DNA sequence: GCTAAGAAAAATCTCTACCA
DNA sequence: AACTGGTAGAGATTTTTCTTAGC
DNA sequence: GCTAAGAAAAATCTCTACCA
DNA sequence: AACTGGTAGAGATTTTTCTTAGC
C-alpha cells in the first residue's frame, strides 16, 4: 500500500498492518 | 506455619544448592518463596533465555567473511535480500586486499550498509578510508557470535559443496571458485519466487526504483488533510497527510511516521 | 471484456501498439494482448557485451562494456596472455548473464584458453563503442588521479563515478539503472512466454447458443474463473464456461 | 514435445550440476524426469534423511562412558529408565579398572544389559570376562556416533555443572565428585513423577517385581480359551489364551505373542 | 533409471508402433513420456 | 510350456522389483560420502548395508536410499 | 446469602546449549 | 538380518484458586 | 452424455547438518 | 541507549489433474 523510510504498510487478508522496513521483501513476482 | 521452613530451606540451599521443587516439596513452603531462594543465589544462574533474533534484510545490505580451502584464502560477500554471491581468492589476509575487494564491489553494485565480524582485516584503516570515500555504513557483530551474520556463513557452506562437485573439471582453485559462483548464481532455482539469485537481485533493485518513482508522482498532487484523535488522552493532533482511505480504516502520515487509524477517530478536511 | 478485446484489435489495426500498453489501457490480460500482437503480419540485444584492451602509464587495462546501456567493468592486467583474458571473461560470465561476446582480431582474444572458456560457459564469440568508452574512462581517470596512490584505485574509482554518478540520456538515468531495467524487462518476457506455451497445449470444444452440437476444436488462450477466451477461424471470442469442454491435445 | 529437452537437460547437468527445478523450468520437461536426472548422479547425493531414532529404555539397561576433568579420569554409569548415577575417579584408563568398576556395580544393582562406545577400555578381555561371569549382554554403538548413548553424555554435562557449583567446599577432586553424585541423586527433583533419581529407581524396580508376582498368580488359574479368525486369509487359529475381555475387544496370547482382536472375530470356549 | 528405457521405447515404437500403456508397462517409464512418444509419431494417435 | 515361462517371468519381475535399492552412506572418523552399496536390513534408526563384501551398520541419519521407479 | 470481577499462584508448553 | 539423542532450565500462555464488592 | 472411483503428478509442511 | 541465525534438501502428508468404466 505504501512504502516509507522506516515502515511499510501492507494489506494482508483484509487486514491493514505496519511492518518495519528491515523485515520485508518487495517483489513484482513474474509467475 | 512455614516460616521456620523458610529458614531451614535457606540453610539447605546454602549447603546443597537444591532446585525449587525439592525445597517446595520437602519443607512445604509455597512455590514463590522457593523460586526466590533459588533466584538469590549467584552460584546458580547459568542458563540463557532460549530464543533467537532476526538480522537486517534491507535492499542494500551486504555481509562479508573469509574462509580457507586447500591452503588458500577465499573472501565471500553476499547480498542478503536475494542471496547473490561474489567471491575471490586473496594472496594474503591483510587489509589492503580487503579494501580493494570492497572498492571493486562498491563500483559494480550499489552498497550502503556492510556487516562484518571483528577480524583484523575488517577493522582496518584501509577499509575505513574506502568506506568513507564510497559512503558505506560499516557495522560489526558482537564478538565471538557468528550468528549475527548467518547468511554469509551459510553461503560458505554452499560454496564448498559446489566446489567439491566440480573440482575435477578444472586445474587450479581460482578457476573452480569462479565456476562455483556461476553455478550458484544462475543454475540453481528455488526459494521466494522460484527464482535464481541473479533473477532475484534484478527483481529487488528494479522494484525499489519503480516504487519510489510511482509514489513520488502520487504524493506530489495530494490533498484532503485529516485531523485525528488518538493516545491515552483524547487530544487532537494537527495536519496529517491522508495516504489511503480504506474499508474499515485510513492510513495517515504524521511527522514522517505511518499510522493506521479507524474511521471513528478521524475527520477529513479538503 | 469482449468490448475491450474489440477496441484493442481496432486500435492495433490503426496504430500497431505493443502488448504492455494495450493490456494497461484496455484492461485485458497480458496473454490476450500478446496474442493480438503475435497474430499481426507486420509485427513479425540485452545480453551482448564488447571487450577491448588498452594502455595507461605502462599498464594494461581491460574493459568490458554492456552495449544497450553503457555499463563498464574494468580491470588492470599484469600481462596480456590468453590465460588472464580467460580469467577476466570467466569472472564476468559468473557475475552477469553473458550470451554474445564481440571482440576484435587480437592475439589474446584468438586463443585456446578463451575458446575453452566460451565452450564451458556457452558464449557465442564474434570477431570484427569501446573506443568511446576508453576515451570517457581515461578522462575521468585523469580527473581524479590526485586522490589515489596506485593506478588500480584510480581505475575502480573512475568505474564507480561512470556507473553511478553521471546522468544523461532521455530521462536522466545512470548506467546502472538502465542495465537493471533492461534485464528486468527481458525476464518478464521470458516468464510470460513459459505461461503461454503451457496454456496453449490444450484444446476446446464449444457449443454456441440455440444449438445442441459441439463446434470445431478451438485453441484455448485464457481460462478464467467464469469465461473462456478461444482462438477459432482467425477470430478471438469469449465463451461462457458452461458451454465449453477443455481437453488435452497431442499434436506435436 | 520434450524428448530433445530431456537430452539437452542431461548434457546440462553433466556440465553444471543443476538441481531439478532449474532443469524443469528451463527445458520444460515434467518434474519426474528432472528428479530422475538428478537422482542418477553420484557427484550429488550428499545429504541424510533428517530424522532421529530412540534408544532402549528397558528396566535393567545401563550405559557407561568416561570423561576428563582437571587432568583426571572420571567414569560415569547411568541407569537409563530412572536417571540414576554412579561415578568414580580412575588412576588410569585401562581395562583393569573398568572391569573392577563394572564388577562392583554388578554386585550392588541388578545389571542385565550394558551399552558402551568403542573405546579401548570397553573392548577388552577383562571386561569380557567380567560380563561372562556376571551374565551381562554387552552391546557397542555404531563407531563415531555419540547419539547412540545420549543419556550418559547428557549426564556428563550435568555432573560437570554441579562440580563447578560445589568446588569451593572441598579440597580434592574425588570428594567433589562424590558430593556431586549425592546432590544429583537426592537433592534435585522434577521429571516423570516429580521424583528424584533415587526415588525413581526404587519405584521402577519394585514395580517390576510386584507386577511379575501378581500376574503369575492370575495366570496360574486361568481358563476360557478363544478361537479367533484373522489375517489376509480367513483361516482359524488354534488354542489362544484369553487375558482380558473388554468393552469393544479382547486381548489374547497366541504363541507367546500379545494380540488385540475385536469381538466379531473370536469365539470363547470354556 | 528409466532413461535407457526412454531410448529403447523410442526404437521399439519406430519398429512396431506400440500404444502408450504397453510401453509404460514393458519399459517401466512414466505415463507422460509414453504418451509423448505416441504423440510425436505422425501416423499414430493416443487413445 | 510357454505359459510356465510367462509365470516365471512375472514372478521374477516381482521378485526383482521388491528389493533393488542403492545406498549412499557416510562413515568413518572423517565422515565422507562413499559409493553405492546394497541394502540388506532396514530397521527404525539404522540400516545394514553390504559394500565390497563387507557388512556395515550405518544410522538412517547418515545415509540416503535410492529406489527405482 | 448468592454471584461475578479481579488478581495471585500454579500448571503446561515450546525452545535452547552442551555432552572429547 | 535385530539398530536408534537426551536432560533440565528460562519464559510465555493457559488454568485454577482466593478475596471482596455489589445486589 | 453425465458422474464418480482410482491413480498419477504436483504442491506444502516439518526437520536436519554445516558454516574456523 | 539502536542489536539480532540461515540455507537448501529428504521424506511425509495433503491436494489437484487425468483416464476410464458404469448408468
Ligand atoms: O566458528 C565459526 N564458524 C562456525 C559457526 C558459524 F559460522 C555460525 C554459527 F551459527 C555457529 C558456528 F559455530 C567462526 C569462527 N571464527 C570466525 C569465523 O568467521 C567463523 O565463522 C572468525 O572469522 N574469527 C575471527 C574474528 C576473531 C578471530 C578471527 O576468531 C573468530 C573465529
Ligand atoms: O564428541 C564427543 N562428544 C560430544 C557429543 C555428544 F556427547 C553427543 C552428541 F550427540 C554429539 C556430540 F558432539 C565424544 C567423542 N568421542 C568419545 C566420546 O565419549 C564423546 O562423547 C569417545 O569416547 N571416543 C573414544 C572412541 C574412539 C575414540 C575414543 O574417539 C571417540 C571420541
Ligand atoms: Cl569475532
Ligand atoms: Cl566410537
Ligand atoms: Mg570471519
Ligand atoms: Mg565465519
Ligand atoms: Mg567415550
Ligand atoms: Mg562421551
Ligand atoms: Zn544456589
Ligand atoms: Zn501489428
Ligand atoms: Zn549431479
Ligand atoms: Zn507410431
Automatic annotation (TrEMBL), chain C:
Domain Integrase catalytic, residue spans: 45-183
The Integrase-type domain, residue ranges: 3-44, 202-249
Positions with a binding annotation for Zn(2+): 12, 16, 40, 43
Signal peptide bounds: none
Membrane-spanning segments: none
Binding positions (Mg(2+) 2): 52, 131
Residue ranges of the annotated DNA-binding region, renumbered to this chain: 202-249
Location(s) in or outside the cell: Host cell membrane; Host cytoplasm; Host nucleus; Virion
Residue positions binding Mg(2+) 1: 52, 104
Family recorded in the similarity comment: Belongs to the retroviral Pol polyprotein family.
Name under which the protein is recorded: Gag-Pol polyprotein
Amino acid at each position: 500500500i505504501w512504502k516509507g523510510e522506516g515502515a511499510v504498510v501492507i494489506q494482508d487478508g483484509q487486514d491493514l498492518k505496519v511492518v518495519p522496513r528491515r523485515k520485508c521483501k518487495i517483489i513484482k513476482d513474474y509467475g | 506455619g512455614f516460616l521456620d521452613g523458610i529458614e531451614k530451606a535457606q540453610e539447605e540451599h546454602e549447603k546443597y544448592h537444591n532446585n525449587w521443587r525439592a525445597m517446595a516439596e520437602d519443607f512445604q513452603i509455597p512455590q514463590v518463596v522457593a523460586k526466590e531462594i533459588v533466584a538469590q543465589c549467584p552460584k546458580c544462574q547459568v542458563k540463557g533465555e532460549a530464543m533467537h533474533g532476526q538480522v537486517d534484510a534491507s535492499p542494500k545490505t551486504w555481509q562479508m567473511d573469509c574462509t580457507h580451502l586447500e591452503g588458500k584464502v577465499i573472501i565471500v560477500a553476499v547480498h542478503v535480500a536475494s542471496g547473490y554471491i561474489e567471491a575471490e581468492v586473496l594472496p594474503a589476509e591483510t587489509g589492503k586486499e580487503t579494501a580493494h575487494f570492497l572498492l571493486k564491489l562498491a563500483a559494480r553494485w550499489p552498497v550502503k550498509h556492510l556487516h562484518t565480524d571483528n577480524g583484523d582485516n575488517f577493522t582496518s584503516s584501509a577499509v575505513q578510508a574506502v568506506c568513507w570515500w564510497a559512503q558505506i555504513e560499516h557495522t560489526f557483530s558482537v564478538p565471538y557470535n557468528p550468528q549475527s551474520h548467518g547468511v554469509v556463513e551459510s553461503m560458505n557452506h554452499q560454496l564448498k559443496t559446489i566446489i567439491t562437485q566440480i573440482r575435477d573439471q578444472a586445474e587450479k582453485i581460482e578457476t573452480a571458485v569462479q565456476m562455483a559462483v556461476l553455478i550458484h548464481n544462475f543454475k540453481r532455482k528455488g526459494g521466494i519466487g522460484g527464482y535464481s539469485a541473479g533473477e532475484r537481485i534484478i527483481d529487488i533493485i528494479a522494484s525499489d526504483l519503480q516504487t519510489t518513482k510511482l509514489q513520488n508522482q502520487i504524493s506530489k498532487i495530494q490533498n484532503f488533510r485529516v485531523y485525528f484523535r488518538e493516545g491515552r488522552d483524547q487530544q487532537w493532533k494537527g495536519p496529517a497527510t491522508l495516504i489511503w482511505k480504506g474499508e474499515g480504516a485510513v492510513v495517515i502520515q504524521d511527522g514522517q511516521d505511518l499510522k493506521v487509524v479507524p474511521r471513528r477517530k478521524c475527520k477529513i478536511i479538503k
